[PDB]
């Protein structure tokens, strides 16, 4: 699984260890070993949310399975919680797009997961 966050928060406000925290919490949330989890944080972005430049985030989570109605509500609570606590972004200024990928459509190590 892979989680990307794009945010207008500056780089200096991303705390030390944040990528390791996201890795751990996503491993636990998706039930997948941490070796399978990739994370990507992109600060200092030119963005607006609802017409305002107040801190916000646009994010995605891709996984082969482990995506669905109840799961995604749970991921949203976890991830918004982390963005609020660590980057001081209000949960109502975050979108997270969830993608249930077919194994045939995910490449890794010279092949695909199908």
């Amino acid at each position: 699984p892979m989680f990307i966050v794009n945010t207008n928060v500056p780089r200096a406000s991303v705390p030390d260890g944040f990528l390791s925290e996201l890795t751990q919490q996503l491993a636990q949330a998706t039930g997948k070993p941490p070796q399978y989890i990739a994370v990507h944080v992109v600060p200092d972005q030119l963005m607006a949310f609802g017409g305002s430049s107040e801190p916000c985030a646009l994010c995605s989570l891709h996984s082969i399975g482990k995506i669905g109605g109840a799961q995604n509500r749970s991921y949203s609570k976890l991830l918004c919680g982390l963005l609020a606590e660590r980057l001081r972004i209000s949960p109502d200024r975050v979108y997270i797009n969830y993608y249930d990928m077919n194994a045939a459509n995910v490449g890794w190590n010279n092949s695909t997961f199908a």
Copy 2:
């Protein structure tokens, strides 16, 4: 709805009110109040289009509904127009990918839109 534009145009060439303009235009185009619209502009990118580093853009529009054949033609005219007028990018060097997201697959404010 959320619009992202990635471009090799430099940051100084993006005009001051550009994010506000995209917000207002997309609110009108999707039929939603501006609270519902997020915009993200990423200049200074290392990109090629057709093998060339001439000005280009790679964009995405995600929405829960308000996506379809006719709508997407209209969005393309609107958005290519803005990118031509404001960023001086030729319409033929723009790709926009459209995504009709399921409400259960969009997280916001600690939950999802389902």
Copy 3:
């Protein structure tokens, strides 16, 4: 078709002509004209893969058709091979998400491909 690579490799490690190399190889692999291929390389990213900040990449390939089980395996071998040779990234620290786009969902030159 559109190929995007996000990586923690520094910009100085991206060789001259890399975006043209990708453009050629993707044209040949997909069978689409090189003039229609867009490539976007984003270095210096704050990323982790399996909890580790060793060189890694998160990529996507979007195409209107030419996406499928065997095709994607072939693209994966090709693209991991280029990232290993040119950017010194281990194939086991690359994910590539493949997207078969409906032509009605791809904007270009003021319209869509439908």
